[model samples]
Target: KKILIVDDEKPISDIIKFNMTKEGYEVVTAFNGREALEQFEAEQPDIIILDLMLPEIDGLEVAKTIRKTSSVPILMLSAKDSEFDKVIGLELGADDYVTKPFSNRELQARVKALLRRS
Candidate 1:
């Protein structure tokens, strides 16, 4: 499966990239929201691993924009756990949210579940 990981933190992206690859997924990445949108459109991934805070555009805006047009499954990865409102996220059309400091296994499982649901 093809997955897109959107986050400004290179190390976080690298770790996901590594683990997901080991999990047998094809992964692509974007460091910021604009590139994320572009990559999403271009890659048309099976799933997206999204981060809500990013340069130029916040993750919420990216998710909102994407929700406006696509039904692609989205799994949010946010560090702003205590601050972010889950209700608003669901209202914006995110399929699931995984707070930061996520373990590779959980992330992989979430991605798998969403894809299976789709």
Candidate 2:
């Protein structure tokens, strides 16, 4: 399966990419919201791992935009571990939400679960 990972922070993105790759997923990455949309359109990835903070467009808008047409799974991420933030992401059409400082194993499990439904 293919996953589009969008995060402005390099270290976190790299870690997620590495873990997902090790899990046998084809990974595509974007460093900013604009690039995320571009990659989303270009790659048509099976799932999207999107960070809440992003340059140019912000992840919330990115997810909303994608939701306009695509029901492809979205696993939203945020550094803030706020229930309000999670609620907003879900209302925006994200399939799952993960706060920053998450375990790779847990995130992978969530990915697997979302993909099963997809």
Candidate 3:
């Protein structure tokens, strides 16, 4: 299995990459929304972990773009107060979401569940 992790925050992206890699999934990462789209095309990842406040395009747009052609699962990352953004993300085709400061185990479980359906 493969995952594309998109986040401008290096520490958060690194932590996700490490945990997913430890679970034996090939992990590809991008620092911004443009790069996230590029990696999505190039990597054809099984799942995506996308941060909402990304530069260039933002996660909602990315999810909208990806949903136009693919049903690959999207898990959005949102700030604690971004309840509205979370709804928009899901409306844009995100399969699930995790708030900032999420537990690794919970994120991993969500990933597994999405992948299982995919």
Report the lDDT of model 2 for residue 13: 90
Q: What local distance difference test score does each model get?
A: 0.86, 0.92, 0.88
Q: What digit string (tens of lDDT, one per residue) describes model 1 on residues 54-112?
A: 64337878899988789999998876566345556666879998887888899888898
**How much is 9 displaced in model 3, in angstroms?**
0.6
Candidate 2 stretches with Cα past 4 Å from truth are 55-57
Clashing pairs in 1: 52-59
User: Compared with the true structure, what per-residue lDDT tens digits does model 3 show for residues 1-118?
Assistant: 9999999999888999999999999999998888988999999999999988865347888899999889999999877446676677788899998887898999999999999898
Q: Which residue runs of candidate 3 sit more than 4 Å off their true CA positions?
A: 55-57
Models 1 onward score TM values of 0.92, 0.96, 0.94
Model 1 quality (TM-score): 0.92
* Regions of candidate 1 where Cα sits further than 4 Å from its true position: 55-57
Model 1 is weakest, by summed lDDT over 10 consecutive residues, at 79-88
True-structure Cα RMSD, model 1: 1.6
lDDT of 3 at 83: 66
Q: How would you order the candidates by lDDT, starting with the best?
A: 2, 3, 1
Model 2, 1-118: lDDT tens digits are: 9999999999999999999999999999999888998999999999999998965338889999999989999999888778888898899889999987898899999999999998
Report RMSD (Å) for each prediction in the order shown: 1.6, 1.3, 1.5
